[PDB]
Amino acid sequence: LTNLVAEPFAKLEQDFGGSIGVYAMDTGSGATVSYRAEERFPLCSSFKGFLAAAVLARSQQQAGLLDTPIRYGKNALVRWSPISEKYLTTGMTVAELSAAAVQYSDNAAANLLLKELGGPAGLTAFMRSIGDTTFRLDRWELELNSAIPGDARDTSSPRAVTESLQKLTLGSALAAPQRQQFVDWLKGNTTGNHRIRAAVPADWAVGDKTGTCGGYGTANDYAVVWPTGRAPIVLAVYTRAPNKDDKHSEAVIAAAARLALEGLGVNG
Ligand SMILES: *C(=O)N1C[C@H](NOS(=O)(=O)O)CC[C@H]1C(=O)NC1CCNCC1
């Protein structure tokens, strides 16, 4: 049921000047679209969705966790901390940091939550616990964005991203209340309007998390999409490119998402 219908991903990535990796799963039939799906690509900010899921998993055993107030200093506010910079003088709860990390890609929030989990290895351990043997987080914000060709640090594959996203949003890896909270955070993302969402009809529900490393044409998005009248679709689109100064493209990600939906025979 993989690649029943071929799609022109090679031409797409050639025009982009790099590599595109796609995995998309129709959760009704199990049909998939797959292109470079087992190659590694940098996560960039996209690890933050899985980070929030890991925090939610912890919260299943710690009923006070989400409402715990976290204080932080000015040193925590690295580049791109749009929410947490507004609450420097007050603190934020763990849930608020989680929402900020997911929905605004907030970097300080992500580092504070990583600390709660025992760092990159702690998040990696959570991913292992749900059966993801591919994912690895190695570094913190901002160092994890280096996106060096061939470097496996801070990478996963489109396939493992999709598989893990499915388990967490639709499967049983989270308890039901936490599952819905994760979905709701993804649905409220603000940074993805020009990526997978651009390929998804406005009358379908969709949650996503983006990433943009800032070098080597490296950027990404993953999403869970609920078309009306049929089962949900899970998909991941990752890019990279050979040269440090190669620029990412949001349009290329949207285009790849369109091809994936077309390959699944989902009318969009
Ligand atoms: C994540 O990859 N980020 C955080 C933020 N938005 O995330 S995104 O997925 O919407 O792109 C901005 C870019 C990126 C990030 O952390 N970039 C670093 C800081 C800015 N200098 C380049 C590396």
Author numbering: 25 to 57, 59 to 252, 254 to 294
From the reporting publication:
Of particular clinical importance is the widely disseminated class A SBLs, including the mobile, plasmid-encoded extended-spectrum CTX-M and carbapenem-hydrolyzing KPC families (both produced in opportunistic Gram-negative bacteria, such as Klebsiella pneumoniae, Pseudomonas aeruginosa, and Escherichia coli), as well as chromosomally encoded L2 from Stenotrophomonas maltophilia (a lung colonist of cystic fibrosis patients). SBLs hydrolyze antibiotics via formation of a hydrolytically labile acyl enzyme intermediate, while MBL catalysis proceeds without a covalent intermediate. The diazabicyclooctanes (DBOs), including avibactam, relebactam, and others, are a new BLI class with improved activity against a wider range of SBL targets than classic BLI scaffolds. DBOs inhibit SBLs through covalent formation of a carbamyl ester to the active-site serine concomitant with DBO ring opening.
Of the KPC carbapenemases, KPC-2, KPC-3, and KPC-4 are the most prevalent in resistant Enterobacteriaceae, differing from KPC-2 by single- or double-point substitutions at amino acid positions 104, 240, and 274 (KPC-3 H274Y; KPC-4 P104R/V240G) that change β-lactam specificity, especially toward the oxyimino-cephalosporin ceftazidime. Of the three KPC variants studied, KPC-4 has the highest apparent inhibition constant for relebactam (Kiapp, 4.8 μM; compared to essentially identical Kiapp values for KPC-2 [1.2 μM] and KPC-3 [1.5 μM]). Relebactam cocomplex structures were obtained after 16-h soaks for CTX-M-15 (1.12 Å, P212121), L2 (1.78 Å, P212121), KPC-2 (1.04 Å, P21212), KPC-3 (1.06 Å, P21212), and KPC-4 (1.04 Å, P21212). In the KPC variants, structures obtained from diffraction data sets collected after exposing crystals to relebactam for 16 hours were observed to contain both intact and desulfated (i.e., in the imine form) relebactam in the active site, at variable occupancies. Consistent with this possibility, in the KPC-2, KPC-3, and KPC-4 structures, inspection of electron density maps indicated the presence of desulfated relebactam, which could be modelled as the imine form of the inhibitor, with occupancies of 0.35, 0.33, and 0.65 for KPC-2, -3, and -4, respectively. In KPC-3 and -4 relebactam complexes, Trp105 is modelled in one conformation, similar to one of the two conformations observed in KPC-2, albeit with high B-factors (30.95 and 33.19 compared with average protein B-factors of 13.61 and 13.24, respectively), suggesting there is still flexibility and movement of this residue. In this conformation, Trp105 faces the DBO core, with the nitrogen of the pyrrole ring ∼3.0 Å from the relebactam imine N6. This is concomitant with well-defined electron density for the relebactam piperidine ring. However, in each of the three KPC complexes, in all of which relebactam was a modelled as a mixture of intact and desulfated forms, Lys73 is at least 0.4 Å more distant from Ser130 than is the case for either the CTX-M-15 (either conformation) or L2 structures.
